[PDB]
Amino acid sequence: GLPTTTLPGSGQFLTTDDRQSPSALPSYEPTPRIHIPGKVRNLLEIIQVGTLIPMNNTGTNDNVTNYLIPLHADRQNEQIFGTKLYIGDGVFKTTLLGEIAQYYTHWSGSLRISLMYTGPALSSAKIILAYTPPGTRGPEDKKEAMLGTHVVWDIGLQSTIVMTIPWTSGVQFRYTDPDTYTSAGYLSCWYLTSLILPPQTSGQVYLLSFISACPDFKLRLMKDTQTISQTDALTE
């Protein structure tokens, strides 16, 4: 009859503890495991996969056109798109990365943005993708933009351009929830030259943009999302 002393917290139910418990079905034999392709071990495995960004946020209702970035021929010096780098909000909120990032509180790492050209093969263009670190306003023109991290894209056989957004930060982790101190800067696109279409061709050409995380990435402090809720319990 071993003397003990019970401590504060005795009897509490902390949803996050990890202990042993008796099995309600003692002696039970689970079905044997069979091989199944596509095993997921860590969420960091799947955010490395790029998914489309609904950059054409313009409109009222969701529609396949949200993923299409319009490009215009014979335009020079002009801006193609702009956006803040709030992965837990704005255009990135619905993406797979932003979707999973919202289950965590902190994030850190480099980002990958690819732009895939879908215009005719007989067309040409030179675009400029830029990342403006925190500390200023979004660039107002290509001149301001090119002063930061950028990539000049030459449209050709190689259909996609990939630009990495290197972890540019003082503090080692930023919040996924949009917070001023932990902002990541801006992202913008402009014509370095201009889109040139061949004869017998007209209208708009579109760009498809993808977002994914680099191996650099980290996400901590698991929490509940704002991307799902309910007013009543569901039934069959």
Binding footprint of a copy of itself on the chain (CB under 8 A): 1-14, 16-19, 21-26, 28-29, 31-32, 172-173, 218, 220-222
200 lines the binding site for other proteins (CB under 8 A): yes
81 closest CA partner among 72, 96, 89, 70: 70
Closest to a copy of itself by CB, 152 vs 171, is 171
- List the structure tokens of 98: 């932003």
* Contact residue for other proteins among 75, 87, 193, 236 (CB under 8 A): 236
Q: How far is the CB of 7 from other proteins (least distance, A)?
A: 7
Closest to a copy of itself by CB, 58 vs 200, is 200
Closest to other proteins by CB, 34 vs 74, is 34
In our burial notation (b when 16+ CB lie closer than 10 A, e otherwise), range 98-125 reads bbbbbebbbbebebbbbbbbebeeebeb
Longest Cα–Cα distance of the chain, Å, equals 96
Contact (CB, 8 A) for 130 and 150: yes
Ramachandran class of 8: left when φ > 0, alpha when ψ lies in -120 to 50, beta otherwise: beta
Residues 2-21: x/- map of binding to other proteins (CB under 8 A)?
Answer: -----xxxxxxxxxx-xxxx
139 lines the binding site for other proteins (CB under 8 A): yes
* Contact residue for other proteins among 63, 75, 76, 77 (CB under 8 A): 63
Which option in a copy of itself, other proteins, none does residue 3 bind, with CB closer than 5 to 8 A by kind? a copy of itself
Contact (CB, 8 A) for 141 and 233: no
